[model samples]
Target chain A: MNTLSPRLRKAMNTAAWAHRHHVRKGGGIPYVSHLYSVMYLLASVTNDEDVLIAGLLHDTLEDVPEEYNSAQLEADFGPRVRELVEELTKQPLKSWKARADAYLLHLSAGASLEAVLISTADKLHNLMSILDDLEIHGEDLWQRFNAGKEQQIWWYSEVYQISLQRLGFNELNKQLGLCVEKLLKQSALEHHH
Target chain B: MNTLSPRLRKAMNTAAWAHRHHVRKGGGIPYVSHLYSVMYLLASVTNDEDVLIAGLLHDTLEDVPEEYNSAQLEADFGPRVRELVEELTKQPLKSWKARADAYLLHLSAGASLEAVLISTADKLHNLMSILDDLEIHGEDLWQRFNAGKEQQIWWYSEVYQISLQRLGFNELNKQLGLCVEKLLKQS
Candidate 1:
């Protein structure tokens, strides 16, 4: 062995850790699956390695709070990765609304295109999963979780609109919008019956 | 004394009724003002009088629920107006999420360019009001109600995207997107 590449090893380790964590949690789909989906989405659009790395570690700092530290993240992952993670972290506002507003403000002020793409993928995967879950669990799950979906759609809509305005990535924006519409239609049809 | 023409009389009466019953009970902006804003936004883009009329009466059945029945709306406002109103009204869902999903689905069905134009105007006005309320009431009102702004934005994005997929109206979509971005940036 050539003593190994630390960055590659860390990325692999994070992916495996996320998989096991989600399996144990039992309520959500595999978290690593979400990470990979985001990675795939990013790769399909842009070939930037930093973005791909950021996508892999995007949730590690925020989701695995106890396992990682900012210092370690900065040291191991470098500033771009650390900054992207920090930007993705949700700040505690006095209220959820303030927290949401703060999040949008950050995005509006020029979050990296990579961060926005990751955020959009994170949202798209979760939303797609929720639709599947509703199909399995039925109306009760929907009633309990629907408000969260509505709120998510609202936030995603804002982000999508802002992204298009700021970046002029019309193709991605259009694709994201269609994904949302398909999900919306699925939920609507499911509920109507 | 030439009284108001029939169309003018009808518009005035509908506006007044919408104000007293729906606007008062709904607890948002005045109904007539909402109607005028929607009409103004619609007229700002397209020259479709029927759509403009639908905007003015979009809430007549959904909000009034008493004085005007769908049948009455159809009879009075014409079939297209009533059909557009019904199209815009979303049925209640088992959950708020489902309700929102349903709402977006209706908006996304690629209704007439006229209807989409009207829907865009309604969304733009609602977003503007949400921002205004946030400014006046500060963060509290936003916390209470403004999260919907995000959902509404998503819905609009989806709608615009679909519209684009089907050969979008570039000028209107760009204009609406710019307006939304301006409001979003206003602290």
Candidate 2:
């Protein structure tokens, strides 16, 4: 229950290599922290290696498109892992809002439970970082992200409700709901102030 | 700079003894965790023994009134520590809203920087706990507090702005800003 297999170790290394050039939105932290954080969150709930590997590589197809193709991931991590990661990979839309809405629609159209779990961890960590960064930088933290604070808050709020509806009340969704609630609560108070 | 003196250790021991009968609002966890968390946060920004001691002892006057008095605290921790703790203590009031507003007015009426730092840490630790508890319990967590979610959120939001104004832009205030921002953010 507590150990990672050889395949899981390789996926972790492969994700680190794939995201080597990418730093998170806040800049100082490595992008792999997000990947590992997502993986760790999923690891807490399930020991399914394919789901765990997909959690680690969820962003590779979306963020580092040129680094590895779908066939490559299928060969490296197995086809099921490739499929889960692919389900989470967002299409490159011109606008942040459009991309966000598209993802919501994608999930609404009945995304697999494994894919939804990975995405829940992904958004939960993102919002958690935003709140953490807001502590040191204040409002200046918003500038680093593709969307502003309000837009990000709204996006996460929509995602939280939709996730709860799609995934039911699992621990993964529960954690995501907690982060989204925190994001909305903070943004609402800031507006009031 | 990072060391706690003999007097500080005594204050910690005293605070733990005083709150021994008291658990926090959420139950199971000892009230001393709040005391220590607040002290730890203050210790991060300042080395003032008085402020640090006051952080550890901040709630004794309000929460465990029968355990220790103002005079006892002054004798054990000295007058300055007692005074800072006294400043952070809330007056007994019939309503939660009144007590919260009174504390805000008290700060606005010119609280000492040390007192504000202690109070800031106190509230920050509190708001942080609320969010942490919410993660495990969901909306059901709100039922464990004195005020409803909206009231707690409003109170912390007011406290954050007031703390920022009182302490200016110092690190302690920044942390309070962060926690209050988080509580209101999470609630």
Predicted candidate 1: interface RMSD?
A: 28.5
Q: Write the per-residue lDDT of candidate 2 for residues B1-187, one digit (tens) a residue.
A: 3343346545655776677666666454456656655665676678788887888788888888898889999888788887788788677889888898898998878688788778777777677666666776988888777799889878877777887887778665675566666665564
- Give the Å shift of residue B97 in candidate 2: 69
Cα lDDT tens digits, model 2, A65-147, are 79767888999888899889888766688987888888899887868977877888788767766766666687777776788
DockQ (C-alpha) of model 2? Answer: 0.01
Q: Candidate 2 - CAPRI tier?
A: incorrect
Candidate 2: deviation at residue A83, Å?
0.7
For A1-193, candidate 1 gives per-residue lDDT tens digits of 0111235334534553433343312242235545544554555455565676677678776677676667777787788878877778888766766777787887777687777777766665555455555566764564544245567667667777776666575445666666567667766876799
Q: What DockQ would candidate 1 receive versus the native complex? A: 0.01
Candidate 1's displacement at residue A32, Å, is: 1.5
Model 2 Cα shift for residue A62 (angstroms): 1.9
TM-score of each: 0.44, 0.50
